[PDB]
Design a binder for these strands. Structure first.
Lengths: 86, 82, 79, 207
RNA sequence: UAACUGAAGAGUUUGAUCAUGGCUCAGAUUGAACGCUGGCGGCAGGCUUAACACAUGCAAGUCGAGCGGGGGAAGGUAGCUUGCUACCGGACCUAGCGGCGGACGGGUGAGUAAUGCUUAGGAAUCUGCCUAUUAGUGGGGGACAACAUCUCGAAAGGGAUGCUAAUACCGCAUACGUCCUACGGGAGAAAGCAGGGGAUCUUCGGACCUUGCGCUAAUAGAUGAGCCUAAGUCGGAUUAGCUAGUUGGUGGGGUAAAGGCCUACCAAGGCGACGAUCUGUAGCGGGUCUGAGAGGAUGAUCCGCCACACUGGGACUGAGACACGGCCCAGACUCCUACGGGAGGCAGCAGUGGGGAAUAUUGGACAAUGGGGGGAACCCUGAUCCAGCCAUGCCGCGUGUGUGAAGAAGGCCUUAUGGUUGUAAAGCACUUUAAGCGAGGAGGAGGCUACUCUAGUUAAUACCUAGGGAUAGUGGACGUUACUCGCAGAAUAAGCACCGGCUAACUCUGUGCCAGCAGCCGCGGUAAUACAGAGGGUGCGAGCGUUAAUCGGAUUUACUGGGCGUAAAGCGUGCGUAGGCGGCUUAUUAAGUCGGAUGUGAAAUCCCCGAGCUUAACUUGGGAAUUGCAUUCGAUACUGGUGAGCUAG
């Protein structure tokens, strides 16, 4: 970087990268937990996992970490797979 | 945004402006959406000095176009004249 | 209000997919003689009604696969 | 650039009076060497010429009286060919519409060179404005007057009295007392001398 | 009114001739170069070669009305070595956090024969700032730069401990819209700052009211971008088979979004003589040059699209990048070093080296038009507007005008005295364009501030917003502007090519197949109109010639528009595949063909009629044109399809 503002932009970039990466890993972990419950196959367990996963997905969608279309797709597909367990 | 502004043409020391509606990110004398008049600051004799299409101006302003200072002054002067 | 083409089927092996041959007649740009040209278009046929040799109509639609963007409308003549 | 030099050899080569001198003396008494070409190998008028020689010799004669060079003359031809009408008639109209020629024919200058000098030295006004370009095209209904400082010139008074010997043309009306004149319209071919042939120029430039 | 009107040949094969057929010449044009010469102005253009390497300066900042610190000026108050000190409130400045911008504007054409471009359409998308409308902006918490200490390094810059503010960050509460839904229900936000103030209170300094700028959720509009389809878009067969995520399907994953985009299975498909695969070359279009047209060549300067940023591979932040002057990695190269450690990318503007036949200043201002930030004041802007250099091009002007012959002098030729230079010169009388000197002097500036008035919002006259009026200030880099008026005196200002024919313009000297000229045919071997000089003349003219390149002439690739007995050219002769073409009558279809309507065919460019430049170049208003494409409605003579019938093949 040649200019002070460019250097400042790089600094803010690395900070924001760290913060966003942590927030995105959280959503990935919760979706993984719901998928594991689905694989386990108990309807109540899968329902609890889905009910715990949904608020985190919506919160991180509202912050711009992920797109709201992606959040809606995740919610719909997970709900369908849970309902499949009867 | 969308703006209404002046694009320069003519010869050296004798500018002649077209009044254009365009995206602000475009180059001054490049891509534009619609041309709605002209301005000649040094008109002489029988030459017209300012033509402006008031209905198109109003229609584009109603959609959120932002005139520049010079274009707004010219529009006010044209409305005063006619 | 939708673009349609009329052709003849030249293949039906693929599942839910048919290949139809379109033909057109144009004048040569320089020498003026009328020339015939052919185009092979993949189409979507959900119920495998079409077979080799029938005359079919197809209409433009959104992509279905890598190479298919047209869908069958009706069978005009049977083989 | 304008031609400068001897005018009588110029006229002798073409064989006809080109009106390049004031005219206080006739051409024959002026030169004494007419019908002889300027060169030592110069011969009589009866020398045979090819068609290419004839077309060239006519165009040169037409250029030499008006004092126009080749670039401007070719531009004149190209404009006359574009304008609808007879090409030769249009070319003659364009040549006779120049400001210096109108000043000469109005009698404020003894010769076209005098008229050109007067126009260039800002001694002429066109429609009330002092101009200095000899090739300005004069339109119908114009007013050419002598500038105030230009007035009371002995050369101008000699020019007007000399012009009195000739005939003031139809399209130009002059108040010589006020040094003022009014071009009305472009001469038609009948007014101009009939010895000039323009067809030769036409195919020469349309080759 | 108008928008077009357009076509020339010559030389050369032979002792003549006609034909065939090449070669050469006369035209237009240029981002040109070189030789000789050179006065001015206007308007344009200016590294086509090394996408070769780069010294140095500039080309992206702004906001204290988001925030905490920290500085240095003044002032006021106190004292007194008396004009010095110490204290206190306001006015200025900004290293850091934070917001917006940096994805625009500018450069280049390496790569790319189709993921690109052009024309016409489509559905499954997102979109900061702008416009309209709807619902809100409640209450908490934990941190980290700055700062302080220590430490490494000459530094440049690094590292480690302890604090701190916010429109930085994260829970909780609430939800007109919004998301999911099994239709029962469940889920998800935000931030404050500034101006003014009547009354009231003020736990003592604000609350409260109001108006702006903000922030959150959502729907439309506009703008921008992503995706898909059809038809077009340069050669090569001395390149004939190519393809296994390959072609299709199902489950799942993934994207803003359709989709083998990815993945696990199932099947064996997909492309190709209408040229697949391989290979050479190349940015594409509007346009430009040429041509009677059809065509051919081309893609500088202007505009649209695409791609690239020392060479390759990636991702982050963000509404938007896989980002020229951002980050990471690998490679080559270059630089500083105290050897500890570091740094860099002109195909941005100017400029250097190198290459080349060849292409310019290390300039001025943000006054104008735009762009970024800001409430404003204002700051930034090598975009831009201007200036400098170059006859590179186009257009215009000047280098003087009239008179002046028993034809001065001098030069050249000669039939030896005439001819010619030539009115040319001298002499006589005049004029002052442009350049030079002096004086005056538009327009490019709309506006802003000050004053006053009116109308909105309010509780308000305050503040803010929108308007009106007159006056006064302030605002131009170009610039000693354009333009106008005075002074001087012809005074400051012409070259280049050619004269056997093609092709306008002829003699004498000098040399003798020598020296030399030459586009083709050809000149020179003692009378050279063709070599060199001189006299004379011709053509152009601040230019004139040569070389290079494209089209034309070339009907010399012939679609318009050519040929094959002997000039070049019928396969040695059959059969036959793909293909091309195909007898008569009738009914029907409307693919070819023809007609109407609608939409589109950007602007600029070409042409026509006008307007403004003292004229012209040039600029500009409105038309005409863009010969095309798509959709839709009609006609049925001919061609094609289908049904029926016939016999001359």
């Amino acid at each position: 970087a040649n200019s002070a503002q460019a250097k400042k932009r790089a600094r803010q970039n690395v900070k924001a990268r760290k913060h966003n990466a942590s927030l995105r890993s959280m959503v990935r972990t919760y979706i993984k937990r719901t998928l594991s419950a689905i694989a386990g196959g108990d309807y109540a367990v899968a329902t609890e996992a889905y009910k715990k996963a949904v608020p985190v997905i919506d919160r991180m969608a509202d912050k711009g970490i992920i797109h709201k279309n992606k959040a809606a797709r995740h919610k719909s597909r997970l709900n369908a797979q849970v309902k499949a367990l009867a | 945004m969308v703006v209404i502004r002046l694009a320069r043409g003519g010869a050296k020391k004798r500018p002649f402006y077209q009044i254009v509606v365009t995206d602000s990110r475009n180059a001054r004398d490049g891509r534009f959406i619609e041309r709605i008049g002209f301005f000649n600051p040094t008109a002489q004799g029988q030459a017209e000095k300012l033509r402006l299409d008031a209905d198109r101006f109003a229609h584009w302003v109603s959609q959120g176009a932002q005139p520049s200072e010079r274009v707004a002054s010219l529009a006010a002067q044209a409305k005063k004249a006619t | 209000t939708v673009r349609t083409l009329t052709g003849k089927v030249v293949s039906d092996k693929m599942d839910k997919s048919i290949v139809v041959l379109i033909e057109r007649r144009v004048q040569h740009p320089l020498y003026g003689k009328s020339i015939r040209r052919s185009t092979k278009l993949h189409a979507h046929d959900e119920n495998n009604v079409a077979k080799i040799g029938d005359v079919v109509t197809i209409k433009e639609s959104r992509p279905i696969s890598k190479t298919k963007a047209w869908t069958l409308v009706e069978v005009v003549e049977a083989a | 650039a304008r031609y400068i030099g001897p005018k009588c050899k110029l006229s002798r080569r073409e064989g006809t009076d080109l009106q390049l001198k004031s005219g206080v003396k006739p051409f024959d008494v002026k030169t004494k060497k007419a019908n002889k070409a300027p060169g030592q190998h110069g011969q009589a008028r009866g020398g045979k010429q090819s068609e290419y020689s004839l077309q060239l010799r006519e165009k040169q004669k037409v250029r030499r009286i008006y004092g126009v060079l080749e670039r401007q003359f070719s531009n004149y031809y190209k404009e006359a060919a574009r304008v609808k009408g007879a090409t030769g008639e249009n070319l003659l109209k364009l040549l006779e519409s120049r400001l210096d020629n109108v000043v000469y024919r109005m009698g404020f200058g003894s010769t076209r060179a005098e008229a050109r000098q007067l126009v260039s030295h800002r001694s002429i006004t066109l429609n009330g404005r002092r101009v200095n370009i000899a090739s300005i095209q004069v339109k119908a209904g114009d007013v050419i007057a002598v500038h105030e400082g230009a007035k009371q010139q002995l050369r101008i008074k000699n020019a007007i009295e000399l012009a009195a010997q000739r005939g003031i043309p139809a399209w130009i009306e002059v108040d010589h007392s006020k040094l003022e004149g009014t071009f009305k319209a472009a001469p038609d071919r009948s007014d101009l001398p009939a010895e000039i042939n323009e067809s030769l120029i036409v195919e020469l430039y349309s080759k």
